[PDB]
Amino acid sequence: MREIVHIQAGQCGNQIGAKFWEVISDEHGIDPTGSYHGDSDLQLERINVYYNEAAGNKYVPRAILVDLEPGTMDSVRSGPFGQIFRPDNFVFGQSGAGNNWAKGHYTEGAELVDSVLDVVRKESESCDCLQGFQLTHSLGGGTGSGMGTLLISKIREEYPDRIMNTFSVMPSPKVSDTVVEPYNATLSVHQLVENTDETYSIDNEALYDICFRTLKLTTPTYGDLNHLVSATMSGVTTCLRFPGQLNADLRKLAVNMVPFPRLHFFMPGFAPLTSRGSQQYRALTVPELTQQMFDSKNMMAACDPRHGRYLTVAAIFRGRMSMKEVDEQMLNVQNKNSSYFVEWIPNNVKTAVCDIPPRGLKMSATFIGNSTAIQELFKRISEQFTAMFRRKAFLHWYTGEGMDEMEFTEAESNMNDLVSEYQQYQ
Amino acid sequence: MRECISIHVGQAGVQIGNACWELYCLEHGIQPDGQMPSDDSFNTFFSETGAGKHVPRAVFVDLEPTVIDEVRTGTYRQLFHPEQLITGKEDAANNYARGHYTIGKEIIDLVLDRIRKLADQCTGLQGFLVFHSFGGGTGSGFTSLLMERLSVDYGKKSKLEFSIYPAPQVSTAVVEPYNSILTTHTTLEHSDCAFMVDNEAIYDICRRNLDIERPTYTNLNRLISQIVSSITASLRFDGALNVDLTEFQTNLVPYPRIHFPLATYAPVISAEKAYHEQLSVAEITNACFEPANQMVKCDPRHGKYMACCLLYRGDVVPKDVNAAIATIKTKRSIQFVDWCPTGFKVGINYQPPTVVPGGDLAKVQRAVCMLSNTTAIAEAWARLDHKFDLMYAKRAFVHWYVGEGMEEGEFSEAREDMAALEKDYEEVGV
Numbered sequence: 103m104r105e106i107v108h109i110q111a112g113q114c115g116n117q118i119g120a121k122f123w124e125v126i127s128d129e130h131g132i133d134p135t136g137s138y139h140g141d142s143d144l145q146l147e148r149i150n151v152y153y154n155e156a157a158g159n160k161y162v163p164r165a166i167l168v169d170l171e172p173g174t175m176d177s178v179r180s181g182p183f184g185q186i187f188r189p190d191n192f193v194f195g196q197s198g199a200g201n202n203w204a205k206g207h208y209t210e211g212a213e214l215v216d217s218v219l220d221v222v223r224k225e226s227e228s229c230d231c232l233q234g235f236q237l238t239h240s241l242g243g244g245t246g247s248g249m250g251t252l253l254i255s256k257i258r259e260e261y262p263d264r265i266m267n268t269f270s271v272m273p274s275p276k277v278s279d280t281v282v283e284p285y286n287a288t289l290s291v292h293q294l295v296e297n298t299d300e301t302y303s304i305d306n307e308a309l310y311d312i313c314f315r316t317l318k319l320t321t322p323t324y325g326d327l328n329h330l331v332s333a334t335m336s337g338v339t340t341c342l343r344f345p346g347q348l349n350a351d352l353r354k355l356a357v358n359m360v361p362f363p364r365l366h367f368f369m370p371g372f373a374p375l376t377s378r379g380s381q382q383y384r385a386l387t388v389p390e391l392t393q394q395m396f397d398s399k400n401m402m403a404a405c406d407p408r409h410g411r412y413l414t415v416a417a418i419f420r421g422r423m424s425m426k427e428v429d430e431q432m433l434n435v436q437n438k439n440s441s442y443f444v445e446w447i448p449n450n451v452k453t454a455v456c457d458i459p460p461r462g463l464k465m466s467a468t469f470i471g472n473s474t475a476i477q478e479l480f481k482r483i484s485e486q487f488t489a490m491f492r493r494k495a496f497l498h499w500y501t502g503e504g505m506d507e508m509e510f511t512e513a514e515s516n517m518n519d520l521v522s523e524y525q526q527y528q
Numbered sequence: 529m530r531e532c533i534s535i536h537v538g539q540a541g542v543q544i545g546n547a548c549w550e551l552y553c554l555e556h557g558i559q560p561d562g563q564m565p566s567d568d569s570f571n572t573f574f575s576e577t578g579a580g581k582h583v584p585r586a587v588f589v590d591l592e593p594t595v596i597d598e599v600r601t602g603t604y605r606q607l608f609h610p611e612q613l614i615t616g617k618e619d620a621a622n623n624y625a626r627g628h629y630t631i632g633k634e635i636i637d638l639v640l641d642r643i644r645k646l647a648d649q650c651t652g653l654q655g656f657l658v659f660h661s662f663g664g665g666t667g668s669g670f671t672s673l674l675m676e677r678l679s680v681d682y683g684k685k686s687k688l689e690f691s692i693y694p695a696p697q698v699s700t701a702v703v704e705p706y707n708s709i710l711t712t713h714t715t716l717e718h719s720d721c722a723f724m725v726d727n728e729a730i731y732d733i734c735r736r737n738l739d740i741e742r743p744t745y746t747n748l749n750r751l752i753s754q755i756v757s758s759i760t761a762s763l764r765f766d767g768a769l770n771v772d773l774t775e776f777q778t779n780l781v782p783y784p785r786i787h788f789p790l791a792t793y794a795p796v797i798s799a800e801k802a803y804h805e806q807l808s809v810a811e812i813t814n815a816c817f818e819p820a821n822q823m824v825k826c827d828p829r830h831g832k833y834m835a836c837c838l839l840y841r842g843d844v845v846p847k848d849v850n851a852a853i854a855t856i857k858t859k860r861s862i863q864f865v866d867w868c869p870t871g872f873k874v875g876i877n878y879q880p881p882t883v884v885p886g887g888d889l890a891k892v893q894r895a896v897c898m899l900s901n902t903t904a905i906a907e908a909w910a911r912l913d914h915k916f917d918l919m920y921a922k923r924a925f926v927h928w929y930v931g932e933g934m935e936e937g938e939f940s941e942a943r944e945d946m947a948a949l950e951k952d953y954e955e956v957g958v
């Protein structure tokens with residue numbers, strides 16, 4: 103029944119993934135051993151969406167773990183929840199990607215993908231009815247960007263009608279740890295625009311802005327950023343795991359969210375978010391849940407939605423709440439902010455409402471925004487790529503892996519074609 | 529004898545069903561396990577097995593498991609026959625073409641096999657009661673696949689249809705206008721009386737009459753079931769003027785395509801208000817001609833009425849009803865067509881309206897359901913085809929419908945057929 107297969111690529115994809123498995127195991131009431139210890143029948147009713155049932159009532163997550171280095175597998179396997187994953191589903195090389203997209207796609211991961219894909223088959227054949235693939239990765243560096251988009255291409259060719267749904271941490275100018283992220287990202291966005299059905303664009307600059315200007319964390323780690331990402335990952339699949347007043351499958355999102363086939367790059371968000379020193383003074387009620395959820399400060403990509411228009415927004419609410427109050431607030435937002443929504447769509451907001459809020463919250467909303475402002479993320483990556491490529495800087499590392507300057511020219515061509523399609527509707 | 533097969537489709541139809549069957553069980557005194565402690569009044573809605581178990585004449589259909597798996601687990605798990613709660617694997621995704629062409633194409637011959645096994649227990653089947661959302665993928669596409677089959681399989685039998693229809697402002701989906709327009713062939717060709725209802729109108733009725741500031745859907749579904757209990761009451765109970773389900777249609781429907789009445793119910797009232805007013809037949813009759821109580825956001829004063837069925841129930845007497853409708857004929861704001869000098873069909877049933885014990889709505893000695901054919905409803909269509917036009921001019925989501933086996937020309941052919949219905953309701957008002 104609507105199974106998801108989840109796949110983790112590179113350091114970032116395995117880190118946002120290994121936190122996601124701690125979050126959905128808390129929801130489903132599964133112990134770090136793999137045993138169920140939860141309160142409620144509703145936790146166990148849809149455990150099949152993310153887990154395989156196994157002997158002794160142990161539940162093994164339907165995750166494939168992919169890397170070109172052993173050291174992230176060693177860090178996950180030794181971690182808070184590491185023993186829960188199937189030993190056969192850790193698929194890895196020895197020599198890394200070197201932060202090179204061409205090592206991922208053409209050499210080091212082209213060797214390994216035959217050993218990955220045949221595990222994705224064992225999980226997908228163990229499904230009763232697969233709904234889709236849920237892939238976590240980063241667009242900077244080489245493993246997530248270049249092997250993860252190789253793997254998207256292989257799974258897309260094999261499963262053409264299932265949902266391909268990716269969570270994609272991607273570069274920004276003021277929070278960059280690598281010289282060649284513009285190249286790696288530009289070569290990777292060229293694969294996402296053609297193959298994925300949804301891509302959730304996430305940024306470390308926006309995840310630090312939530313930590314500093316909303317949560318008021320003094321020293322936010324990558325573990326704190328991974329917690330913000332994985333809350334929205336748990337959010338969008340909620341309606342295929344729990345009952346609700348309005349159910350929305352990942353496909354019921356896509357049909358409402360994607361007006362034209364290629365405009366599937368989404369900007370996620372979450373509510374409530376508070377400092378731990380101010381949760382005492384807020385009322386969590388749907389109007390306050392809404393006023394935060396649509397705030398330019400709350401969204402997990404550096405694009406301000408006041409620099410564009412929304413095509414579609416989806417607000418996936420969780421908790422015991424009024425349908426009048428939810429339908430009132432999603433009306434009031436797009437009438438009082440009407441200059442920020444496209445006027446050729448007569449209602450821009452999808453709503454969904456689950457009966458089961460996150461453990462320790464009375465209510466939650468996960469926000470998904472499709473906005474013409476996402477062009478500013480692809481535009482800045484293309485403007486950084488352009489400066490390095492106009493002088494062929496660092497290209498012997500890619501052409502030494504058998505790549506061409508023609509593939510760089512074709513990737514940046516397709517990047518500006520994606521920017522032009524979002525700008526067209528602005 | 530006098531059976532009705534009740535078919536509940538998608539999330540909206542199933543959740544209205546879970547309120548309808550909550551009501552019918554209380555009204556006939558059937559326990560939620562289907563047993564009856566201590567007349568054939570239940571026979572329209574329940575088949576009786578030799579154990580003394582009353583099993584409902586209903587089919588619940590959804591293309592995804594979630595809502596019917598909740599019916600299979602909640603207090604009514606023992607009421608229904610387990611194979612007439614029908615689920616697929618795959619959601620219809622608010623896409624008409626998944627409901628009609630691609631996903632619902634697999635479940636249909638299992639659904640019709642259950643309807644046949646119900647109809648073969650009916651000794652004198654009166655009609656079908658079909659419950660759905662106009663905005664849903666299962667709601668529009670599966671109901672339109674099912675009705676096309678029922679209209680060749682049961683061509684004589686009356687098909688009454690209860691539709692949650694998109695609002696002026698309130699909406700839950702971007703593609704609600706596409707699914708609703710594609711449905712207009714179903715209601716025109718394969719339905720006999722189609723009761724449009726609106727979430728935004730019932731929310732405003734809840735705010736003004738029930739004093740509930742922020743309602744859920746469970747508050748709406750206890751009003752949509754109160755109307756079908758009032759339509760079917762003459763089939764189930766003794767009355768002064770019992771109305772047959774074809775007698776109803778012979779007075780409601782002036783022309784074959786002109787079968788989209790409004791409905792309203794009175795008194796919708798909070799139990800705290802109901803002590804401080806007397807709620808006489810004339811008060812509750814006049815309440816039905818307020819714009820404030822119409823369950824579609826359109827104004828009846830911008831139309832002409834063609835025919836009304838005032839379906840009274842409880843402590844109502846034919847004197848008081850004649851005296852009431854004589855005042856409705858006196859008022860010039862309530863305008864009828866020149867060609868209907870009679871105006872009113874009246875039904876009067878001796879069974880008071882049943883309170884659901886968890887409900888927002890008062891105990892009252894009297895109720896009326898007014899079902900009402902009026903030209904005004906064409907504005908609810910002229911709202912929604914203007915939502916369709918803005919999106920279809922851009923082809924704004926059409927690749928998801930074309931991608932699941934629909935002809936692109938069906939959008940033009942559905943907007944065309946809606947303009948011919950909106951023409952007919954303007955054309956008869958002269």
Ligand SMILES: CC(=O)O[C@H]1C(=O)[C@@]2(C)[C@H]([C@H](OC(=O)c3ccccc3)[C@]3(O)C[C@H](OC(=O)[C@H](O)[C@@H](NC(=O)c4ccccc4)c4ccccc4)C(C)=C1C3(C)C)[C@]1(OC(C)=O)CO[C@@H]1C[C@@H]2O
Nearest residue numbers: 124125128326329330333336374375376381460461462463
């Ligand atoms: C008493 C009280 O209100 O406690 C809250 C709390 O103080 C706040 C600050 C929590 C807290 O969040 C954080 O500390 C945090 C830090 C960095 C990044 C992200 C979160 C909380 O830790 C987080 C925790 O949330 C959960 O436990 C959810 O089930 C969540 N899962 C996890 O956080 C989790 C943690 C460890 C292991 C496994 C799961 C979740 C989110 C989305 C979907 C599914 C589950 C909650 C409500 C609280 C505390 C405990 C203080 C907040 O988080 C959530 C998701 O509600 C941060 O802002 C909100 C508002 C809350 O008021």
Ligand SMILES: Nc1nc2c(ncn2[C@@H]2O[C@H](COP(=O)(O)OP(=O)(O)OP(=O)(O)O)[C@@H](O)[C@H]2O)c(=O)[nH]1
Nearest residue numbers: 538539540543620621622661664665666667745748
């Ligand atoms: N009153 C009422 N309205 C409902 C209820 N559930 C859904 N609706 C309305 O139904 C419309 C959307 O239809 P869906 O619930 O998505 O219909 P569906 O057939 O399940 O659609 P699919 O998921 O695509 O199969 C919205 O306008 C809702 O307001 C309910 O329980 N009561």
Ligand SMILES: Nc1nc2c(ncn2[C@@H]2O[C@H](COP(=O)(O)OP(=O)(O)O)[C@@H](O)[C@H]2O)c(=O)[nH]1
Nearest residue numbers: 112113114117240242243244245246279324327
């Ligand atoms: N949020 C998050 N970002 C990370 C994490 N680790 C690395 N990153 C950041 O995102 C980029 C990810 O690249 P990486 O995953 O290391 O490349 P790969 O291993 O070759 O795929 C890095 O440059 C970091 O800025 C992590 O745990 N969480």
Ligand SMILES: [Mg+2]
Nearest residue numbers: 538539664666
């Ligand atoms: Mg549905």
